[PDB]
RNA sequence: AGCCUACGGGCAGGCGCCGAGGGUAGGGCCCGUGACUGGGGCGAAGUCGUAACAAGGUAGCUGUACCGGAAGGUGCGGCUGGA
RNA sequence: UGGAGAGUUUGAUCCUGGCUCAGGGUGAACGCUGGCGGCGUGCCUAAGACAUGCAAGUCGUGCGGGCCGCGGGGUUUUACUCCGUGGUCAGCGGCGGACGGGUGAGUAACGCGUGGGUGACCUACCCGGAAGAGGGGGACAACCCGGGGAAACUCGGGCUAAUCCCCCAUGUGGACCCGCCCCUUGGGGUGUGUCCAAAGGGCUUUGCCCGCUUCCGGAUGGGCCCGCGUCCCAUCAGCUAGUUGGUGGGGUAAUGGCCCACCAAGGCGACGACGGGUAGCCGGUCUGAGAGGAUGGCCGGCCACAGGGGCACUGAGACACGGGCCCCACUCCUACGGGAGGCAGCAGUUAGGAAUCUUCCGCAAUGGGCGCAAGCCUGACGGAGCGACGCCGCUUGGAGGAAGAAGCCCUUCGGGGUGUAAACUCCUGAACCCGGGACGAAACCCCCGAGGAGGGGACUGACGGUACCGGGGUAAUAGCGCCGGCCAACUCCGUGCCAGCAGCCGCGGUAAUACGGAGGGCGCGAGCGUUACCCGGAUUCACUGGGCGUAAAGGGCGUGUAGGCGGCCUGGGGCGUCCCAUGUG
C-alpha cells in the first residue's frame, strides 16, 4: 500500500530525511508521490523538522500508512491531536 | 483530448472504411521555413456514406482494426477531387523513378 | 601546500616591490634597491620586448604572488568572481581581501601575509569567538577577528599588536588594540585597495 | 539450495489440478447443453444451462475463472442456448432465461 | 483399457493443430583469403628520349579516332586559357 | 554579461585553401614522483567461465504431528498417556518470493520522451461507506507398515486436523439472457427468470479485538490506444498472404487480424516504403558567445534481459535471475539404470585487457517482508577497507640574516649568477604521547487515560574511544614538464645529416639557446607529463554565419511533372502567427 516515510538524503554521516508519500514497493530514495515534510535527525538547525499537516491529514484519510518512526514525527508535529 | 483533425478521403475501396489524408504544417526546427507534411489514416465508415473527394473530420477512437483507429466524425464539404488528383498524381510519378 | 622558498626573487622578477616580508622589505631592500633587476644569470642584460601574453601573465602572477595563494584556488575564485554580478575585476579583488589569513595581515596581527597564515593554521586566531585555522575562510562582514584566548600572551602577538597601535589601518577595517580584536566592517572597495596590478590585465589573461 | 520455494511449487501442482478439473466440467457441461439446445430438448437443455451458470460462478469464487470472464462465459453460454431453442421451441422450462 | 466418483463428472492416457530446434536443397548480402594480374603512391643513384612553360623552337588545349618504345603524332571539329 | 587567435604554399604581395597548435572536458590508462585528511568514485573489454561464504522469508493468535525440555497429573490406585507450557524439525494452510539488488545482450519499436484517450480495462495488502456468516460433508501430507534405489528421490497399503477442498440455506448486493427508460461506442436506472457468498482464532469470555464474505467508492500501481519528437546507407526503389478491410466466432482484465472460418481486393512508398548497418531511451552530462555539435558511466524514471532457445503452471500481479517443463552448450556425481548445477546479487576466483576494489562491520539508523506483539530475515542499506581515479581543505615552517659563506655555473678575469638562499638567532608546533569523548536514538514496548487524543516511564550505537574538546609536544616529503617561432623562460660543454629531436613550421653536415649533460630560467605542484576520446578554435557543411567569370563549384540546351514561391482592392473564416489565463513541464 501507499506509505508515508523517510527517504535519506544529504552526505555520509550527515543524514537528512525527507517525509513523503510513496508506494511501499518504491526503492526508498526513489520517485515519490509527493513530499510532505522534512526532518533533520540531528537538529543542527532551529527548523530541525517540519510537516505540511494540511495534506498529511488528507493522505492518512485516503488510506496512507506511516512507518512507526514516521508516526513519531507526525505525532510530534501534532497531526493526531484533535481537541 | 480525443484528438480530431481534418482531411480529404483518398480511398473508399475497402468495406466500411475510408482512407483520409491530412496535411499539417510547422516551422522547420533549424531553418524556420514553415514546411508541410501529411499522413494517411484508415477511418471507420460503418455505412460508406462518405465518398471519394470528401473533406472530413476524423476523431481518435477505440481500435477498430490493425490500422483503423479513427472514426469519421462529420462531412466538412463534399466533392474536391482536385485534391485527390494531387495525391494520385504524386503517386503516378513514383512509377517514373524505379529501374 | 603554499609557496615556501626564496620570495625576494619574486620581488625582483615582477620588477615591482612585493611587500611580503616584515622589517626587510622596508630596510634598504625588499631585496630591491640593491638588485632591482630580475634573478638568474641574465636579468641584468638588455631587456627583451614583452608579448601581450608576457604582460597579461605577469600582471596576473604579480597579484597571485602578492596573496601568496595557489593557482587552483586563485582560479576557482576568478570564475566565482564572474558568476557574481558586479565588476568582475574589482569583485575578484574583493573575494581576495575577504580571505581570512589576509584579514589577519591587514589587521596588523602579522608582519607578513605568510606569517599571517602560520598564525592562522596554528589556531592562534578566532572569529566571533571560535577558533579557525583555514586561511581560506571567507570573512563575512561584521566578524570579531580576535586573537586566540591562549594566544594573547605571546612574544609575537603582543609585539606585533604593540607595534600596531596608532597606525590607523583599513577603511573597511576596525582594529581594537585593546582586546586585540578587530572587525570586518564590510567588503573592501575599488580604491580602498592599492596594489601594483591593473586588474583588467588579469581578466584579459583568463580569456585565453 | 533447499530453499522451500518448492513449498509453493508443490502447491501450484495441487492447484493446477483443481483449476483444470473445475474448468473442464464447465466446457463439457456447456457443450452438453448447447447440443441439447440446437437439438430440441429444452426441457433439460436449460436444466443443464443452470448447472453451468452455477458451476461457472462456483469456480468464479475461487482463484480459477474470475473477473468479468465469469460473465463472458455465462454471456455467450446462455446467449447461444437461447438462439438454439429459439429455432422453434419457445422457452419451455422457466429456469435459466427470463422471458 | 487404468484411477476417482456423491454416477452428473474428473484425472491419467491417446490423437490432432501449432511448435523450439535439427536435416536436406536452392538462392541473397557481407567478410577473409588466392597462383597470377592491373594500375596508384613513396624511395640514394638509375636507363631512353624532350611532350609541356618563351613561335618551347610544328601555338597550346580539348572531344573523338587511328597509330607509335615512351612522352607523344596525326585526322576531324571546337576553345583562346594563344598572335 | 557574452565572442582574441597563431604557424605553414611566395623572391615578395593579396586572396583562396587545407593541415597543425594554444582551451575545456574524462568511469580513464601509461611514465616519473608521491605527505595528511573530508566528500565522492572505481571491469568502458568476454551478456566469457566460476571454488567458497552470504544474499527471502516469516506466522504456534490458521491446523495436526515428530523429537527434547520444565510444571502437573489422571481413574478408589497403577501401565501410561492425558493436560499446560517453552523450544525444535518438517508437513498442511496463509502472506511475501513479480519488490528490492545486477546487467545493456536484444530492441530503430508506441521502446523511449512528451501531451492525451480508455463508453474497451485490471488493481493484493491500505482507507471510507452498505450488508452478512445457519447447517451438513470430504480429501491429502506430516505419522505408521512394507517394498525399489548408489544417490536424487520414489511406488504401494493404512489413519488424521484446520482460516484447505465441497454440498445445502439466507442474497445486502453482484453476474448473465431479454424488455423498457435515460445517456450515448460496452455509461446509468429498472422489471421478470436464472446464478454466486463466508473461517475461524485470541483475550481481561458474554465484551473487546485480529481475521473472513458480497457490493459500491477512494488511494496506489498497471494493461491497452493515439498525436507529435527520436541514428547512418538511395552504390537498398520498389514492398506486402494475415498481406488491407469486412461479417461471424476464438482468446483476454480489456480493444485489435492477436488467432480462426467465410467474403471483399486491398494496405505502404522519394514527406524515403522495403533492405542493410548501428544502438537501450530519457531527466541530464561535456563543449560553445550563442545557434549548434557530442553524449547517456555515477544518481532518478522507463524498458529489456538473467548461459542460448522455446513453453506454459501458480497467482491480484510473472512467462518469473536465486520457481516448473523441454531442446542446445558447459560444469559435476554415479554402482552407468540414473542424477545435480547456473554471480549481469555481495565479496572473491579465472580468462580477456592499457585498465577497475575488501571473500570486512552492523541491522544501531532508514526502507522492505512476515507477525497481535515479542521478534525474525534483510551483502537493500548504514559504515569501514583498497586505488592521487575526481573534487576540496592542508603540511614540508615563520621573522631576523652578508655589498653576499662554501660548492657549482658563467667571465670582457675586473666580476657576474644561484642568493636571504644556506648556516646561525629567535618564534610557532604537522607528527607523536596523555585525559576526557559524542550527535546520529525516539518509536516500537510498559502503566495513567479507553487499546483513541494527551501524559508519563524505560530499552537499543556497527561506525568508535572514531569525530571533537582539553594538556604535553618534535622544524617536519618535492617533485614533473618546458626554455627556436606559436609560447612564459639563455648560457657553457659534448656531439658533427652521426647520435638523436619533433604537435605543425622545421633543428643537427665545427663554431646548435631545437640533439645530450650542466648552470640558470619559466610554468604548474602531491602532482606533473604522455597517449586516447569528445566539443572548441573550425566562420572549414556557414539557420545564426560560406560560396560557384578566372581559386573547388551553373546542369550542353530546351519542354514540362510533383514541389517551392507569387501583383492591387473589399469582405467571411481564424489553420499558420500573436497575447492572456490555466494544466503539465
Ligand atoms: Mg519525486
Ligand atoms: Mg524507528
Ligand atoms: Mg505551435
Ligand atoms: Mg484488421
Ligand atoms: Mg473489425
Ligand atoms: Mg521513365
Ligand atoms: Mg529512383
Ligand atoms: Mg533503368
Ligand atoms: Mg535494378
Ligand atoms: Mg585540474
Ligand atoms: Mg587550545
Ligand atoms: Mg571564454
Ligand atoms: Mg575562447
Ligand atoms: Mg533453486
Ligand atoms: Mg516452512
Ligand atoms: Mg506458501
Ligand atoms: Mg442419466
Ligand atoms: Mg494451438
Ligand atoms: Mg506445422
Ligand atoms: Mg530451423
Ligand atoms: Mg523450422
Ligand atoms: Mg532450417
Ligand atoms: Mg549440393
Ligand atoms: Mg559483416
Ligand atoms: Mg573473393
Ligand atoms: Mg587483372
Ligand atoms: Mg601489384
Ligand atoms: Mg607516400
Ligand atoms: Mg620506400
Ligand atoms: Mg605538342
Ligand atoms: Mg629545351
Ligand atoms: Mg623540338
Ligand atoms: Mg605544322
Ligand atoms: Mg603556347
Ligand atoms: Mg586528346
Ligand atoms: Mg579532361
Ligand atoms: Mg619499339
Ligand atoms: Mg609497352
Ligand atoms: Mg603520324
Ligand atoms: Mg585542331
Ligand atoms: Mg562551339
Ligand atoms: Mg562555334
Ligand atoms: Mg583561332
Ligand atoms: Mg600563353
Ligand atoms: Mg592578331
Ligand atoms: Mg544585455
Ligand atoms: Mg562566459
Ligand atoms: Mg602548410
Ligand atoms: Mg613551408
Ligand atoms: Mg603555387
Ligand atoms: Mg620561401
Ligand atoms: Mg612559383
Ligand atoms: Mg611569381
Ligand atoms: Mg590558415
Ligand atoms: Mg583540420
Ligand atoms: Mg586537450
Ligand atoms: Mg574516463
Ligand atoms: Mg609509472
Ligand atoms: Mg559526491
Ligand atoms: Mg574513498
Ligand atoms: Mg560489462
Ligand atoms: Mg560504455
Ligand atoms: Mg567478466
Ligand atoms: Mg547475512
Ligand atoms: Mg524465502
Ligand atoms: Mg537467507
Ligand atoms: Mg518428553
Ligand atoms: Mg522431556
Ligand atoms: Mg517432569
Ligand atoms: Mg512406575
Ligand atoms: Mg508413560
Ligand atoms: Mg510406553
Ligand atoms: Mg502438548
Ligand atoms: Mg513450523
Ligand atoms: Mg505452506
Ligand atoms: Mg486469503
Ligand atoms: Mg527487480
Ligand atoms: Mg532491477
Ligand atoms: Mg548499488
Ligand atoms: Mg543503487
Ligand atoms: Mg554486478
Ligand atoms: Mg558491481
Ligand atoms: Mg550502453
Ligand atoms: Mg509506448
Ligand atoms: Mg512511435
Ligand atoms: Mg506516446
Ligand atoms: Mg504516455
Ligand atoms: Mg502525461
Ligand atoms: Mg494514461
Ligand atoms: Mg485496488
Ligand atoms: Mg485507477
Ligand atoms: Mg498481499
Ligand atoms: Mg471496506
Ligand atoms: Mg449493501
Ligand atoms: Mg480427494
Ligand atoms: Mg503417502
Ligand atoms: Mg499408523
Ligand atoms: Mg541403501
Ligand atoms: Mg497412501
Ligand atoms: Mg481424515
Ligand atoms: Mg474431518
Ligand atoms: Mg470439518
Ligand atoms: Mg423507466
Ligand atoms: Mg430515467
Ligand atoms: Mg446499456
Ligand atoms: Mg456497471
Ligand atoms: Mg438489463
Ligand atoms: Mg439454485
Ligand atoms: Mg447458494
Ligand atoms: Mg465462560
Ligand atoms: Mg455474547
Ligand atoms: Mg470482560
Ligand atoms: Mg491477532
Ligand atoms: Mg457510493
Ligand atoms: Mg465517484
Ligand atoms: Mg476497490
Ligand atoms: Mg500492478
Ligand atoms: Mg492509464
Ligand atoms: Mg493489468
Ligand atoms: Mg516533441
Ligand atoms: Mg516515428
Ligand atoms: Mg539526444
Ligand atoms: Mg541513404
Ligand atoms: Mg552498396
Ligand atoms: Mg538493390
Ligand atoms: Mg520504385
Ligand atoms: Mg525484387
Ligand atoms: Mg487468408
Ligand atoms: Mg470480433
Ligand atoms: Mg486477471
Ligand atoms: Mg471482443
Ligand atoms: Mg497479423
Ligand atoms: Mg474480427
Ligand atoms: Mg483467416
Ligand atoms: Mg486451418
Ligand atoms: Mg462472408
Ligand atoms: Mg461476392
Ligand atoms: Mg468468390
Ligand atoms: Mg474477391
Ligand atoms: Mg494491387
Ligand atoms: Mg497496390
Ligand atoms: Mg508521410
Ligand atoms: Mg531509407
Ligand atoms: Mg555504447
Ligand atoms: Mg542495448
Ligand atoms: Mg538533450
Ligand atoms: Mg558527456
Ligand atoms: Mg555556456
Ligand atoms: Mg548544448
Ligand atoms: Mg562511457
Ligand atoms: Mg556498472
Ligand atoms: Mg532471452
Ligand atoms: Mg534465457
Ligand atoms: Mg498472491
Ligand atoms: Mg502467467
Ligand atoms: Mg521476463
Ligand atoms: Mg521469480
Ligand atoms: Mg524461468
Ligand atoms: Mg544468482
Ligand atoms: Mg513458484
Ligand atoms: Mg544436454
Ligand atoms: Mg570431474
Ligand atoms: Mg568422476
Ligand atoms: Mg564418471
Ligand atoms: Mg557399474
Ligand atoms: Mg544400480
Ligand atoms: Mg530408464
Ligand atoms: Mg547423464
Ligand atoms: Mg560477485
Ligand atoms: Mg557463489
Ligand atoms: Mg560484485
Ligand atoms: Mg574482483
Ligand atoms: Mg585479471
Ligand atoms: Mg592478463
Ligand atoms: Mg566499493
Ligand atoms: Mg525503521
Ligand atoms: Mg525496520
Ligand atoms: Mg500486553
Ligand atoms: Mg521463535
Ligand atoms: Mg537467513
Ligand atoms: Mg552482514
Ligand atoms: Mg556499502
Ligand atoms: Mg598519475
Ligand atoms: Mg600509483
Ligand atoms: Mg588538491
Ligand atoms: Mg658585512
Ligand atoms: Mg653577489
Ligand atoms: Mg660573488
Ligand atoms: Mg657563493
Ligand atoms: Mg660575462
Ligand atoms: Mg675567477
Ligand atoms: Mg661590476
Ligand atoms: Mg674574482
Ligand atoms: Mg650547518
Ligand atoms: Mg621575537
Ligand atoms: Mg632554541
Ligand atoms: Mg601549545
Ligand atoms: Mg592527531
Ligand atoms: Mg586519548
Ligand atoms: Mg564515558
Ligand atoms: Mg522513532
Ligand atoms: Mg512516548
Ligand atoms: Mg526499529
Ligand atoms: Mg516492524
Ligand atoms: Mg488498562
Ligand atoms: Mg494497557
Ligand atoms: Mg497515547
Ligand atoms: Mg559505544
Ligand atoms: Mg563500540
Ligand atoms: Mg582514551
Ligand atoms: Mg621547542
Ligand atoms: Mg625544515
Ligand atoms: Mg628554520
Ligand atoms: Mg609545459
Ligand atoms: Mg625560447
Ligand atoms: Mg620550442
Ligand atoms: Mg616557446
Ligand atoms: Mg609545446
Ligand atoms: Mg656520437
Ligand atoms: Mg666541438
Ligand atoms: Mg658547440
Ligand atoms: Mg650549425
Ligand atoms: Mg641547449
Ligand atoms: Mg635546472
Ligand atoms: Mg592542472
Ligand atoms: Mg594529466
Ligand atoms: Mg568516439
Ligand atoms: Mg574538433
Ligand atoms: Mg581556424
Ligand atoms: Mg583549422
Ligand atoms: Mg570543410
Ligand atoms: Mg576558417
Ligand atoms: Mg545550416
Ligand atoms: Mg568560405
Ligand atoms: Mg575551375
Ligand atoms: Mg551554361
Ligand atoms: Mg561545366
Ligand atoms: Mg561538361
Ligand atoms: Mg548529359
Ligand atoms: Mg507532360
Ligand atoms: Mg514530365
Ligand atoms: Mg505548384
Ligand atoms: Mg501573398
Ligand atoms: Mg500559395
Ligand atoms: Mg481600394
Ligand atoms: Mg489586401
Ligand atoms: Mg467587396
Ligand atoms: Mg483576406
Ligand atoms: Mg489560428
Ligand atoms: Mg488577454
Ligand atoms: Mg505567456
Ligand atoms: Mg503555461
Ligand atoms: Mg501549473
Ligand atoms: Mg506555470
Ligand atoms: Mg520544477
Ligand atoms: Zn623583499
Swiss-Prot record, chain A:
Pfam family, one: Ribosomal_S16
Gene Ontology terms: biological process: translation
Domain of life: Bacteria
An annotated GO cellular component: cytoplasm
UniProt KW rRNA-binding keyword: yes
Keyword Zinc: no
InterPro entries reported for this sequence: Ribosomal_bS16, Ribosomal_bS16_dom_sf
Single Gene Ontology MF annotation: rRNA binding
Keywords: Ribonucleoprotein, Ribosomal protein, RNA-binding, rRNA-binding
Assembly description: Part of the 30S ribosomal subunit.
Record family assignment: Belongs to the bacterial ribosomal protein bS16 family.
Function: Binds to the lower part of the body of the 30S subunit, where it stabilizes two of its domains.
Name the record gives this protein: Small ribosomal subunit protein bS16
UniProtKB/Swiss-Prot annotation, chain B:
Subunit and partners: Part of the 30S ribosomal subunit.
Function: One of the primary rRNA binding proteins, it binds specifically to the 5'-end of 16S ribosomal RNA.
HAMAP family: Ribosomal_uS17_B
Gene3D superfamilies named among the record's database cross-references: Nucleic acid-binding proteins
Gene that this sequence comes from: rpsQ
UniProt GO molecular function: rRNA binding; structural constituent of ribosome
NCBIfam families found in the cross-reference section: PRK05610.1, uS17_bact
Domain of life of the organism encoding this protein: Bacteria
Family under the similarity heading: Belongs to the universal ribosomal protein uS17 family.
Keywords linked to the UniProt accession: Ribonucleoprotein, Ribosomal protein, RNA-binding, rRNA-binding
UniProt protein name: Small ribosomal subunit protein uS17
Gene Ontology annotations of biological process type: translation
CC annotations in GO: cytosolic small ribosomal subunit
UniProtKB/Swiss-Prot annotation, chain C:
Record-annotated S4 RNA-binding domain positions: 99-161
Binding of Zn(2+), residues: 8, 11, 25, 30
Zinc finger (C4-type): 8-30
Entry's Gene Ontology cellular component terms: small ribosomal subunit
Origin: domain of life: Bacteria
GO term, biological process aspect, one: translation
SUPFAM superfamilies for this protein: Alpha-L RNA-binding motif
GO molecular function: rRNA binding; structural constituent of ribosome; zinc ion binding
Alphabetic keyword roster: Metal-binding, Ribonucleoprotein, Ribosomal protein, RNA-binding, rRNA-binding, Zinc, Zinc-finger
Cofactor note (record): Binds 1 zinc ion per subunit.
Cofactor(s) named in the record: Zn(2+)
Family annotation (HAMAP family): Ribosomal_uS4_B
Biological function: One of the primary rRNA binding proteins, it binds directly to 16S rRNA where it helps nucleate assembly of the body and platform of the 30S subunit.
UniProt record similarity statement: Belongs to the universal ribosomal protein uS4 family.
Subunit structure: Part of the 30S ribosomal subunit. Contacts protein S5. The interaction surface between S4 and S5 is involved in control of translational fidelity.
Name of this chain's protein: Small ribosomal subunit protein uS4
Lineage: Bacteria, Thermotogati, Deinococcota, Deinococci, Thermales
Protein encoded by which gene: rpsD
Curated annotation (Swiss-Prot), chain D:
GO molecular function, one term: small ribosomal subunit rRNA binding
Keyword RNA-binding in annotation: yes
A GO cellular-component term linked to this record: small ribosomal subunit
Disordered: region residues: 1-26
Gene3D superfamilies from the UniProt entry: Ribosomal protein S20
BP-aspect Gene Ontology terms: translation
Signal sequence, start to end: none
Matching Pfam families: Ribosomal_S20p
S-S bonds: none
Basic residues bias locations: 1-25
Keywords annotated in UniProt: Ribonucleoprotein, Ribosomal protein, RNA-binding, rRNA-binding
Family indicated by similarity: Belongs to the bacterial ribosomal protein bS20 family.
Record's function text: Binds directly to 16S ribosomal RNA.
PANTHER family with a match to the protein in the record: 30S RIBOSOMAL PROTEIN S20 (PTHR33398), SMALL RIBOSOMAL SUBUNIT PROTEIN BS20C (PTHR33398:SF1)
Protein name: Small ribosomal subunit protein bS20
Source species taxonomy: Bacteria, Thermotogati, Deinococcota, Deinococci, Thermales
Amino acid at each position: 500500500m501507499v506509505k508515508i516515510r523517510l527517504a535519506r538524503f544529504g552526505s555520509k554521516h550527515n543524514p537528512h530525511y525527507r517525509i513523503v508519500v510513496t508506494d511501499a514497493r518504491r526503492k526508498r530514495d526513489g520517485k515519490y508521490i509527493e513530499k510532505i515534510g522534512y526532518y533533520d535527525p540531528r537538529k543542527t538547525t532551529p527548523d530541525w523538522l517540519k510537516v505540511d499537516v494540511e495534506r498529511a491529514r488528507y493522505w492518512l484519510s485516503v488510506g496512507a500508512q506511516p512507518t512507526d518512526t514516521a508516526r513519531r514525527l507526525l505525532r510530534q508535529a501534532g497531526v493526531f491531536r484533535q481537541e | 483530448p480525443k484528438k480530431v483533425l481534418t482531411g480529404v478521403v483518398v480511398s473508399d475501396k475497402m468495406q466500411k472504411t475510408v482512407t483520409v489524408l491530412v496535411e499539417r504544417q510547422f516551422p522547420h526546427p533549424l531553418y524556420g521555413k514553415v514546411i508541410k507534411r501529411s499522413k494517411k489514416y484508415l477511418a471507420h465508415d460503418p455505412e460508406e456514406k462518405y465518398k471519394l473527394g470528401d473533406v472530413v473530420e476524423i476523431i481518435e477512437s477505440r481500435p477498430i482494426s490493425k490500422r483503423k483507429r479513427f472514426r469519421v466524425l462529420r462531412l466538412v464539404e463534399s466533392g474536391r477531387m482536385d485534391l485527390v488528383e494531387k495525391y494520385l498524381i504524386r503517386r503516378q510519378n513514383y512509377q517514373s523513378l524505379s529501374k | 601546500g603554499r609557496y615556501i622558498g626564496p620570495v625576494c626573487r619574486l620581488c625582483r622578477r615582477e620588477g615591482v616591490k612585493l611587500y611580503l616580508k616584515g622589517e626587510r622589505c622596508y630596510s634598504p631592500k625588499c631585496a630591491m634597491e640593491r638588485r632591482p633587476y630580475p634573478p638568474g644569470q641574465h636579468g641584468q642584460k638588455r631587456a627583451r620586448r614583452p608579448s601581450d601574453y608576457a604582460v597579461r601573465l605577469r600582471e596576473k602572477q604579480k597579484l597571485r604572488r602578492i596573496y601568496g595563494i595557489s593557482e587552483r584556488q586563485f582560479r576557482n575564485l576568478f570564475e566565482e568572481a564572474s558568476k557574481k554580478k558586479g565588476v568582475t575585476g574589482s569583485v575578484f579583488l574583493g573575494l581576495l581581501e575577504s580571505r581570512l589569513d589576509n584579514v589577519v595581515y591587514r589587521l596588523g596581527f602579522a608582519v607578513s601575509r605568510r606569517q599571517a597564515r602560520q598564525l592562522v593554521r596554528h589556531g592562534h586566531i578566532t572569529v566571533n569567538g571560535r577558533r579557525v585555522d583555514l586561511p581560506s575562510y571567507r570573512v563575512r562582514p561584521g566578524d570579531e577577528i580576535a586573537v586566540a584566548e591562549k594566544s594573547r600572551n605571546l612574544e609575537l602577538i603582543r609585539q606585533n599588536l604593540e607595534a600596531m597601535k596608532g597606525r590607523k589601518v583599513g577603511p573597511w577595517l576596525s582594529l581594537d588594540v585593546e582586546g586585540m580584536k578587530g572587525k570586518f566592517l564590510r567588503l573592501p572597495d575599488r580604491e580602498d585597495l592599492a596594489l601594483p596590478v591593473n586588474e583588467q590585465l588579469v581578466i584579459e589573461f583568463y580569456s585565453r | 539450495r533447499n530453499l522451500s520455494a518448492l513449498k509453493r511449487h508443490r502447491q501450484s501442482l495441487k492447484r493446477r489440478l483443481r483449476n483444470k478439473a473445475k474448468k473442464s466440467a464447465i466446457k463439457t457441461l456447456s457443450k452438453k447443453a448447447v447440443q441439447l439446445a440446437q437439438e430440441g430438448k429444452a426441457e433439460e437443455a436449460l436444466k443443464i444451462m443452470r448447472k453451468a451458470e452455477s458451476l461457472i460462478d462456483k469456480a468464479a469464487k475461487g482463484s480459477t475463472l474470475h473477473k468479468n470472464a465469469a460473465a463472458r462465459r455465462k454471456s455467450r453460454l446462455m446467449r447461444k442456448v437461447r438462439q438454439l431453442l429459439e429455432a422453434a421451441g419457445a422457452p419451455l422450462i422457466g429456469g435459466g432465461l427470463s422471458a
